């Protein structure tokens, strides 16, 4: 702010002001609020809580069976070298 003498800035907005209204009042709000609809315990989703496999491992079962059977052919006898 600058004040300049001799033209000085009025020393106030004075008493000639026009009170325009008495509408100043905010009427307090008084209220009762009830949000009470029956609630049912459940919601349907496509899927909740699953941690789906991105790849599975290979998996398997097992079997064996049979017996011990055989047809054989042997090497001929040979002269013994030494000993």
């Amino acid at each position: 702010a600058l004040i300049n003498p001799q033209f000085p800035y009025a020393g106030p907005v004075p008493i000639p002001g026009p009170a325009p209204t008495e509408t100043m009042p905010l009427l307090n709000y008084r209220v009762e609020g009830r949000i009470a609809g029956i609630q049912q315990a459940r919601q349907f989703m496509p899927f909740l809580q699953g941690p789906h496999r991105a790849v599975a491992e290979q998996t398997y079962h097992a079997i064996g069976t049979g017996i011990q059977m055989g047809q054989t052919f042997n090497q001929p006898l040979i002269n013994t070298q030494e000993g």
Binding site: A54, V55, Y60, G64, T65, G66, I67, Q68
Partner: protein, 47 residues
């Protein structure tokens, strides 16, 4: 030498972009592949 092995279904595909397609067209696919079945170590026989 390097078999197609996706670990996820369809990760890999065989592609054919046709120039002309007649009525009742189709691709007849043929595959050679390896895949795991299972093994254990027991037998007996007494007589």
């Amino acid at each position: 030498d390097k078999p197609i092995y996706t670990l996820q279904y369809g990760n890999v595909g065989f592609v054919v972009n046709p120039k002309t397609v007649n009525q009742n067209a189709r691709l007849l696919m043929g595959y050679e592949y390896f895949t795991s079945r299972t093994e254990l170590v027991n037998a007996g026989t007494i007589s």
